[PDB]
Symmetry: C3
């Protein structure tokens, strides 16, 4: 895209503020930002806020979201589709033109770990170029295992293809499959979908802890066989809905856009790989690391 | 196949009649019928009854099916395998030769949304060429959410490959991935697996309704990440068995041949896309539309 | 690998012995062994014990495994990762050098049907070349349907690619997808992942029996749509954990490394194919047979 040549829009922080007991404002951007998805490999991503996947959104069950998208892309329209919400797609997930903003309001009625993504046609193109992310909706009544959890992180799986190549997006294997982690609490890492950061800077935990991961496989195209090496998931809540409760799973199958809350115990010090067990994808980047120490700091 | 050149056997209605409180007769054909799977693209499909996927079959839990296949294909044997039934495959799912009929009897003991398909070797060839469909077995005791459902439809996902090309069937990506809808009640649409009909003639619903979809991904080869844009599944019954009850799923993973009953509420007027969230497949056709109006008519 | 030319190390029996009420010794090898994966097609597999998938391991919930790997590979290190266990991957799943042994101890706290595999980088290479298998951990309190089961077998699905070809492993479709069966009781077959043995020597059962299969799809790369033709799964326990209990499934989606206990009734004499319903994979080998006779012997 000629108007994207040389464009690298600096990341912009997500803006969120609660405006009522059940109402939250969220403002994101759509912007074009260079991301190093593998060493030496820059992808001029189509993004929300200069991150791919985009910034984490967390709201409470029953919050209505008053969402503004500021489209900084000089030429391509963009939009926002939150899987969390009940909305009219043709009214509420509509395009915002370059250099314009749009505001849309819709409720997040359901707890869980939801994909969000750009909804502009061709949706595959917008997702594959980077416009994906997660919104977590916290259950009003929690999860039954909340009191057992010592630490928690968010992980997202996505693929990267040949740059803005619709044929490859439709018909080709992913060039990279990657994890990223998005911060829930101050000091948590906040990374983009790349093949290396969560290997070189593992997530941290302490021996004996029960870890919760909020996970989503945003695709665009692949399913995920999510597995933590050296442990078993004590409890899994499919899509993060507390009712969808499995126990003792070695691996959690996630459809494209599928989410889960998974919990597991790390019993010994060491480094625990986190993979999709579709090992072609793991080999192409989709291995993160959890470093478990006696203290929980590196 | 030389004997299929120029062959386009007009669709024949499914014939079904109840012959006892727990016994039903079904007669289908196997026939060769041109189907427009994408605009300008005719596939000379191997079909049941001139539809691909084939006609919907609905029976009650505990019905024994006395099934007749009339093979109108001039040269290729065909057969029928219902995933609903308990049967001896080597006695009851056997081939019916060209211009012959065969009758087989077997019980549908289990509620759900089952694939049916031709079972003639190579099965991949018979399925990929179009010989797939759904049989719904209605649970004797219903689903616990039956009283909440306002409207219901059947959707089927399938792929199309290069024409009768076993190498492509085995080793190639699908050229198209498509939805079709099969009528449950008079006035429901009844369509074939194509890239456009359910976009141009969306399924219809009314604002505020809870919609049930009986869905099956017949493949032949892909899994499906089934998602309705703008809503969340309130309730999901995997394979349509009432016991396999999930709640609040954004997306339902369906194996190849996998079924589900999914229910969701449409809260606002508009058009709601229905996708597999494996967006390569969506881009290659697998987007249907649900048009939600204040009245429920177009 | 030059040092593997001409190498065909004869299979070595798994060695296991109970050493305490909750402690078991297991000794395996890593070895290079020619396996006929399709007729006329020898794969010089990287294996545990000269089998691919490797030998079945069965332990009880709560057993600690004192595992020794004797690496007979003349040049490549190998390791063992049991999905059943809680272990430090970087201490307990570490490499054993050629002509050395290593012993590692870890508990199997969780019931189910777990993948095991070599964990040596690149893991994809070690798995794809054959270093995969299943460990079953028997639940202390059984499964609620135990008393209904008449007969049981273990089946494993795996893929085979072009020989030791990392590009193909990462980016190519599988050349073969196969089932094997591993013996639970004397007289059960014990086979390797190939396209033909379980067609030519079907598993055996008797009319009217309820069959349990312990299944795992070890991949490396594909998911599995596991289906038995002519029946429906009465009960399914995902990953073999008794809590993850589905009923009346036609087909069970297994992620890569995913396991299940599935149970079904065979009501009539005949031969019942067992497939992954991703029919490209079935066509490329992944069809096993269950021969059901009035007596249960051939
Ligand atoms: Cl692993
Ligand atoms: Cl979508
Ligand atoms: Cl089948
Ligand atoms: Cu507001
Ligand atoms: Cu966009
Ligand atoms: Cu593993
Ligand atoms: Cu009759
Ligand atoms: Cu046929
Ligand atoms: Cu979506
Ligand atoms: Cu010992
Ligand atoms: Cu190895
Ligand atoms: Cu089938
Ligand atoms: Na591992
Ligand atoms: Na969408
Ligand atoms: Na079949």
């Amino acid at each position: 895209i000629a108007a994207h040549k040389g464009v690298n829009q600096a990341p912009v922080p997500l803006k969120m503020e609660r405006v009522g007991p059940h109402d939250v404002h969220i403002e994101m951007t759509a912007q074009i930002t260079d991301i190093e998805i593998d060493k030496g490999k820059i992808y001029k991503a189509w993004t929300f806020n200069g991150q791919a996947p985009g910034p984490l959104v967390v709201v409470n069950e029953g919050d209505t979201i008053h969402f503004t998208l500021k489209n900084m892309d000089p030429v391509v329209p963009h939009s926002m589709d939150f899987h969390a919400v009940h909305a009219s797609p043709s009214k509420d997930f509509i395009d915002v033109m370059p250099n314009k903003s749009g505001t849309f309001t819709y409720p997040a009625n359901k707890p869980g770990v939801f994909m969000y993504h750009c909804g502009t046609k061709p949706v595959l193109q917008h997702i594959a170029n980077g416009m994906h992310g997660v919104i977590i909706v916290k259950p009003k009544n929690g999860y039954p295992t909340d009191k057992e959890v010592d630490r928690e992180y968010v992980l997202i799986q996505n693929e990267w293809y040949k740059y803005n190549d619709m044929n490859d997006f439709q018909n080709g294997v992913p060039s990279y499959v990657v994890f990223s982690s998005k911060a829930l609490k101050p000091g948590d890492p906040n990374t983009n979908g790349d093949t290396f950061t969560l290997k070189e800077k593992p997530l941290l935990a302490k021996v004996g802890e029960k870890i919760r991961l909020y996970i989503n496989n945003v695709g665009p195209n692949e399913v995920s066989s999510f597995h933590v090496v050296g442990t078993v998931f004590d409890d899994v809540y499919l899509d993060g809905n507390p009712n969808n409760h499995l126990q003792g799973m070695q691996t959690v199958m996630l459809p494209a856009s599928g989410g889960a809350v998974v919990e597991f115990t790390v019993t010994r010090p060491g480094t625990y790989p986190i993979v999709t067990h579709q090992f072609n994808h793991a080999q192409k980047g989709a291995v993160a690391m959890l470093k478990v120490t006696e203290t929980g700091e590196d």
